[PDB]
Automatic annotation (TrEMBL):
Residue intervals of the BetaCoV S1-NTD domain: 1-284
Disulfide bonds: 7-151, 146-179, 158-238, 272-282
Name assigned to this protein: Spike glycoprotein
Sugar-bearing residue positions: 45
Taxonomic path: Viruses, Riboviria, Orthornavirae, Pisuviricota, Pisoniviricetes
């Protein structure tokens, strides 16, 4: 279970469907993938050695995405799906596109990051929303940090047009919920992949995002005064069959070599300590 409130009793079983699959491709940071722009700092036509919360080049991704229709397993809401959140995570999220009657729909999983997922604690929720306005799909990423009464089996649903056997049910709060942060961010419904950095430092949670390149940009930060310990990528239920991807690899404090072009755009990155060839590159001066 995620939270400790039973929100549903309909079509819940104890079926084992397998563990999260591992990508055949490892973490590759060469083009800037896995890095983010430095907050309030513009570097132009230069190379920079700096410390941040980065993935490790050569390491693996796990596909944490879960998709069902009606039947949901209790095991989907336990480890290894419910996972540890230490320093942070880097995410490569597939924007699954589905076309029905001339309308393209955008679908990908929501994620929650918290400790106990009980309303005596704050939980981070990053959830997509879509609507069709004048035959053109609009997309929003809703990010909130609230004392949610999270459900035991939290899940989202697809756009109503694609068909649903279940209702959206990931928390249950009929009163006023205390939130430290909440707002909507736009996302490109036509993007192939969305990239995220989520990390914590000195009691402060940070979020970075992009869907227009491979280098993420600062969205927001919030002071919690506590340490987050777990993350969970929520199942998405839909009557339409589709394949979802939410690739996750951990972040740790690492020294990277970043290359910025004349416009201040990151075009190259080296994970200095990932192997000896990278160590050579970083030892050869550059800041
Ligand atoms: C972000 O945008 C979404 C979608 O417009 C907002 O969610 C709606 O909130 C209203 C008022 O509470 C409800 O009547 C709708 O049912 C909600 N729609 C959906 C799809 O959830 C949300 O309030 C916005 N968040 C913030 C922080 O402004
Ligand atoms: C960029 O920096 C390099 C040194 O690494 C220098 O040769 C070049 O003149 C600079 N270009 C611009 C447009 O400032």
């Amino acid at each position: 279970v995620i939270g400790d409130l039973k929100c549903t009793t309909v079509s819940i079983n104890d079926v084992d469907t397998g563990a999260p699959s591992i990508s055949t491709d490892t973490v590759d940071v060469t083009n800037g993938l896995g890095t983010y722009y430095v907050l309030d700092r513009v570097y132009l036509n230069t190379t920079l050695l700096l410390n941040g919360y980065y993935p490790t080049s050569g390491s693996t991704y796990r596909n944490m995405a879960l998709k069902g229709t009606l039947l949901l397993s209790r095991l989907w809401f336990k480890p290894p799906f419910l996972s540890d959140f230490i320093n942070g995570i880097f995410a490569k999220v597939k924007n699954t596109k589905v076309i029905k009657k001339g309308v393209m729909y955008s679908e990908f999983p929501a994620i929650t990051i918290g400790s106990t997922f009980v309303n005596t604690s704050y939980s981070v929720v990053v959830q997509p929303h879509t609507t069709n306005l004048d035959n053109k799909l609009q997309g929003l990423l809703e990010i909130s940090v609230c004392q949610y009464t999270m459900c035991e089996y939290p899940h989202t649903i697809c756009h109503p047009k694609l068909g649903n056997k279940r209702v959206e049910l990931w928390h249950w709060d009929t009163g006023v919920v205390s939130c430290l942060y909440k707002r909507n961010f736009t996302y490109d419904v036509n993007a192939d992949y969305l990239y995220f950095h989520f990390y914590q430092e000195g009691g402060t949670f940070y979020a970075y995002f992009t869907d227009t390149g491979v280098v993420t940009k600062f969205l927001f930060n919030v002071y919690l005064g506590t340490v987050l310990s777990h993350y969970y990528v929520l199942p998405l239920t839909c009557s339409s069959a589709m394949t979802l991807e939410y690739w996750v690899t951990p972040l740790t404090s690492k020294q990277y070599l970043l290359a910025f072009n004349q416009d201040g755009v990151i075009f190259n990155a080296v994970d200095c300590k990932s192997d000896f060839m990278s160590e050579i590159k970083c030892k050869t001066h550059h800041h």
